[PDB]
Amino acid sequence: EVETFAFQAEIAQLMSLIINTFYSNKEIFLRELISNSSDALDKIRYESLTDPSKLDSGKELHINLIPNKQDRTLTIVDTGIGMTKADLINNLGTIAKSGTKAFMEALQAGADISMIGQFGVGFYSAYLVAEKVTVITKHNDDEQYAWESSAGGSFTVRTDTGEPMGRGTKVILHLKEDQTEYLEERRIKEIVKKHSQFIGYPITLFVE
Amino acid sequence: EVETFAFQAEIAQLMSLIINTFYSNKEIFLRELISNSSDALDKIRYESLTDPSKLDSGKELHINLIPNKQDRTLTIVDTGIGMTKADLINNLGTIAKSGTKAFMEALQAGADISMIGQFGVGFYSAYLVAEKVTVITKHNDDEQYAWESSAGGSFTVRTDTGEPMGRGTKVILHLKEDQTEYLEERRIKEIVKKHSQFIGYPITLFVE
Ligand SMILES: COc1ccc(CO)cc1O
Numbered sequence: 571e572v573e574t575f576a577f578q579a580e581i582a583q584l585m586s587l588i589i590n591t592f593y594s595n596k597e598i599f600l601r602e603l604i605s606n607s608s609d610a611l612d613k614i615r616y617e618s619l620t621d622p623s624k625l626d627s628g629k630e631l632h633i634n635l636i637p638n639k640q641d642r643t644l645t646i647v648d649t650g651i652g653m654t655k656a657d658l659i660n661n662l663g664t665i666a667k668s669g670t671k672a673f674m675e676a677l678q679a680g681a682d683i684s685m686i687g688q689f690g691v692g693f694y695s696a697y698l699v700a701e702k703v704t705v706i707t708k709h710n711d712d713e714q715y716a717w718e719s720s721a722g723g724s725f726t727v728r729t730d731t732g733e734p735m736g737r738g739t740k741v742i743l744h745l746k747e748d749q750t751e752y753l754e755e756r757r758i759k760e761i762v763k764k765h766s767q768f769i770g771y772p773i774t775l776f777v778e
Numbered sequence: 779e780v781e782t783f784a785f786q787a788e789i790a791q792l793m794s795l796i797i798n799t800f801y802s803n804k805e806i807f808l809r810e811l812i813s814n815s816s817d818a819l820d821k822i823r824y825e826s827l828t829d830p831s832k833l834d835s836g837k838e839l840h841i842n843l844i845p846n847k848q849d850r851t852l853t854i855v856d857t858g859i860g861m862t863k864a865d866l867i868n869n870l871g872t873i874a875k876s877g878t879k880a881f882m883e884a885l886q887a888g889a890d891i892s893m894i895g896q897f898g899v900g901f902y903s904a905y906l907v908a909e910k911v912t913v914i915t916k917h918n919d920d921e922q923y924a925w926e927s928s929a930g931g932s933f934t935v936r937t938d939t940g941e942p943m944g945r946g947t948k949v950i951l952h953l954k955e956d957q958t959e960y961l962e963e964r965r966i967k968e969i970v971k972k973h974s975q976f977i978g979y980p981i982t983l984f985v986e
C-alpha cells in the first residue's frame with residue numbers, strides 16, 4: 571500500500587528549476603540538509619525542556635553522514651523531531667509554495683541557487699545531486715513513514731516497516747551517475763568543514 | 779501583578795557578553811529581530827495551511843518598523859505566531875542555554891558577535907543597542923503578555939492590558955543614549971536593504 575500524490579504546481583516548478591538550471595556549485599545541498607537536521611534537533615530539544623519524556627524515543631541528538639558506494643547513496647540521519655504523515659505530504663513541514671514564490675523573484679533580483687535555504691525550501695536542493703530521494707521519518711505522535719520522489723511531478727508515501735528508527739529523519743540520496751564525488755570521504759569532510767562548522771550537534775561521517 | 783524571574787546563568791552570561799564586549803557592528807540587531815519575525819510569520823502561515831481559523835486573529839502577515847524619537851524607541855512588530863507565557867519565560871521560545879554554549883565556543887574558534895543568529899539566540903542582540911527591551915506577545919492559545927528586561931540577571935512578566943494586538947510579537951527597544959542613529963529613517967532603510975532584502979513578508983518603515 572503506496573499512496574501517490576501530485577506536487578503542487580509551484581513545488582514541481584522549483585524541482586524542475588533545480589534539475590534544469592546549469593549551476594556548478596552543487597555542494598551546497600549538504601549544508602541545506604544538515605541545517606534542516608539542526609532545526610529539527612532544536613525542536614525536539616525545545617519540547618524536552620518542558621516534557622522530558624519526548625526524549626524517550628532516544629536521548630542522543632546528532633547527525634550521521636553515511637556514504638555507500640555500492641548503493642550509490644549518501645544518507646543524512648538526524649534524531650530530530652521527525653515529521654507526521656501530514657507534515658510529510660504538506661511539503662516536508664515547509665511553506666514551500668510561498669517559499670518558491672519568494673525564491674523565484676529573488677532569482678530575478680540577482681540571487682543564485684545557493685541562497686535556496688533563505689526561502690525555507692532547502693530540502694529540494696537534494697535534487698542538485700540525487701536522481702531519487704527517499705525520506706524516512708518518525709515523529710513521537712505518529713508512525714514511521716517513507717516518502718519517495720524522482721521528481722517528475724509526483725511523490726509517494728507508504729508506512730515504513732523497514733528498520734525502526736525510534737525518532738528522526740533519514741534522507742537517502744540516490745546520487746546521479748556523475749555526482750559520486752559526494753561519496754568520497756575527503757570531499758564530504760571538506761564540505762562539512764566549509765559550510766557546516768558551527769552546527770551545534772555532533773556530525774559523524776561514517777566510513778566504508 | 780508583575781512576576782520577576784532570574785535568567786538562567788548562561789543567558790545572563792550571554793547578555794553580559796553582548797553588553798560588555800567592544801564590538802562596533804551593532805547594526806546587525808535589526809537583521810536578527812526581523813529574522814525572528816520572519817520565522818514566526820512562517821509558523822502561523824504553516825499552521826493555517828491545515829486550519830485556516832488560525833488566521834482569525836488577523837490574516838495579514840507582515841513586519842512593521844516604528845521609530846519614535848520622543849520616546850527613544852524602535853519597535854519591531856510582527857503578526858507571527860506569538861508566544862505563550864511558557865515560551866516567553868523559557869527564553870522567548872529558544873534553546874538559549876545550549877545556543878549560548880555553542881556561540882561561546884564559536885567565539886573561541888574565531889567567530890564574531892554578528893554570527894549570533896546561527897546559534898539561535900539572536901533576540902539577545904537587542905542588547906547591542908537597547909538599555910531596556912519590552913516584548914509584547916499574543917499567541918492564539920493564550921493571553922497577551924508583556925516581558926521586560928534591562929538585563930542585570932532578571933526579567934519580568936505581566937499580563938498586558940495595553941492595546942490588544944490580535945496576534946504576534948512586538949519588540950520595543952528603549953535605545954541607549956548614544957544609539958539614536960537607529961531612529962533615523964535613512965539609516966533604518968539602509969540596514970534593511972543591506973541585511974534583510976530577501977525577507978518574504980512586507981516590511982513597512984513608519985515615518986514620524
Ligand atoms: C523536521 O525534520 C526534518 C524535516 C525535513 C528534513 C529534510 O532535510 C529533515 C528533517 O530533519
Ligand SMILES: COc1ccc(CO)cc1O
Nearest residue numbers: 811814815818858860947
Ligand atoms: C515566535 O515569535 C517571536 C519570538 C521571538 C521574537 C524576538 O525577536 C520575535 C518573534 O516574533
